[PDB]
Write a protein that binds this ligand. Structure first.
Ligand SMILES: [Cl-]
Ligand SMILES: [Cl-]
Ligand SMILES: [Cl-]
Ligand SMILES: [Cl-]
Lengths: 84, 84
């Protein structure tokens, strides 16, 4: 899979999700990560995120894609496509 | 195209982007919208968003997909898949 991960997390866990996702996926916007993973990394990422998360005040959408998607970007880009 | 739109916008324009996107796309998480559009709607959405946006403090990624992507969701879901 290639995933894009976008989350809405409270200030008490938001620093934790960022540090965790940044060791599996590329950071491209605030609250948004993407990259290639395997089913190992995937459910590692996924449960790894559930442990971190209060599933009762917090939301993660992980879009499960074939491959890296084309995109378009308005405004202050934070991570040039090349770097991802 | 089918797009997922995720944005990071300052409090002075954040209410405007939401109201605008909500008339083209489905709201599924804070700062995240998705749905089917046409090239009319697309560049309508896209410039429509640039007018709203300070491209100098703000970011929009519009992922350009074939079709609606599969996904998985942790925690408080805000819009059951059926509704989108
Ligand atoms: Cl990163
Ligand atoms: Cl890929
Ligand atoms: Cl909506
Ligand atoms: Cl579709």
């Amino acid at each position: 899979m290639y995933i894009v991960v976008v989350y809405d997390v409270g200030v008490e866990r938001v620093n934790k999700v960022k540090k965790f996702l940044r060791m599996h996926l590329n950071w491209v916007q605030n609250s948004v990560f993407e990259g290639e993973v395997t089913l190992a990394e995937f459910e590692r990422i996924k449960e790894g995120l559930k442990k971190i998360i209060d599933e009762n005040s917090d939301s993660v959408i992980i879009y499960k894609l074939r491959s890296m998607p084309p995109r378009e970007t308005l405004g202050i880009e934070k991570n040039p496509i090349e770097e991802i």
